[PDB]
Amino acid sequence: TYGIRLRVWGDYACFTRPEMKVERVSYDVMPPSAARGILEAIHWKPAIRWIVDRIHVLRPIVFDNVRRNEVSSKIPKPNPATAMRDRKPLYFLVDDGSNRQQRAATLLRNVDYVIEAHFELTDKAGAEDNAGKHLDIFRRRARAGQSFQQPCLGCREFPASFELLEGDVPLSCYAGEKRDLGYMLLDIDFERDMTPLFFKAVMEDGVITPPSRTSPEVRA
RNA sequence: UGGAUUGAAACGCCAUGCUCAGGCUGGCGAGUGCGCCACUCAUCA
């Protein structure tokens, strides 16, 4: 493999924090998990996986508030019930009761990122050269505007415009370390389905994330 | 074609600026003042 740097940008974005999920407050930047999820919406096969090495932030960080009427708890049943016939009308109250939540998103604006990513090979590989074929298929798809689904920027309410960046990583807005980003999520683990969080090295120009598949945490 | 702390997620239903009220009651544009004085349609077949 050689790595590939994709450019992804949009008007809105919401990479929700883990704490502030009900009244969403996004991270300042795209996290590695969201980035890999963007990638797997352009090309992905169960033979490969995506790892992220860097994420370049090319624009100011600017927040915005948008409240939406949203379904609340789909509350567990207090009394079991069954439909009168097989295929007939059944519903969900989205306007009466406490089934209207009005969640307030503190989502980003006018975001622009460049993701560096690579190709490991897992079980169900089939061969040891899958990296080349799949990397080149993804490159073709990025160039031709093709995709399995329109990538989002967090939620599907915000679609991501994506191009294949083959030139130099363009001028960013951050040339000296005036931002530290705190302590972010690395990538939701699925071997144990837990939350490994990584940030122990500052963000200088491009967030330098460790591979989620080798060092799950500084604890280990 | 697993998996973007994701995927599902109206701020939505309704509401008179109404009822009525003189811009009225009266007040000279008036009192005076030369258009005046003076000038050949002439001289000739």
Three-state DSSP string of A58-102: CCCCCEEEEEECCCCCCCCCCCCCCCCCCCCCCCCCCCCCCCCCC
Residue A30 CA, nucleotide B40 C1', distance (Å): 124
Technique behind this structure? Answer: cryo-EM
Which nucleotide's C1' atom has the smallest distance to the CA of A195? B5
Q: Could you give the CA distance from residue A115 to residue A22 in angstroms, rounded to a whole number?
A: 28
Domain count, chain A: 1
For A62, half-sphere exposure in the C-beta direction (CA atoms, 13 angstrom radius) is: 11
Q: Could you give the CA distance from residue A175 to residue A70 in angstroms, rounded to a whole number?
A: 40
Identify whether the C-beta of residue A34 lies closer than 8 Å to the C-beta of residue A154. Answer: yes
Phi, then psi, of A167 in degrees rounded to 5: -85, -160
Which nucleotide's C1' atom has the smallest distance to the CA of A158? B4
CA angle centred on A53, ends A48 and A54, rounded to 5°: 135
Q: Which domain holds residue A64?
A: 1-220
Å resolution of this model?
Answer: 3.1
Q: Could you give the CA distance from residue A69 to residue A136 in angstroms, rounded to a whole number?
A: 42
Residue A169 CA, nucleotide B17 C1', distance (Å): 63
Residues 6+ apart with CB under 8 A from A211: A51, A53
| Side chain identity, residue A9 | W
Burial of A79 (0-12, 13-18, 19+ CB in 10 A): exposed
The continuous run of DSSP H or E covering A186 comes out as none
Q: Could you give the CA distance from residue A33 to residue A16 in angstroms, rounded to a whole number?
A: 11
Residue A43 CA, nucleotide B19 C1', distance (Å): 73
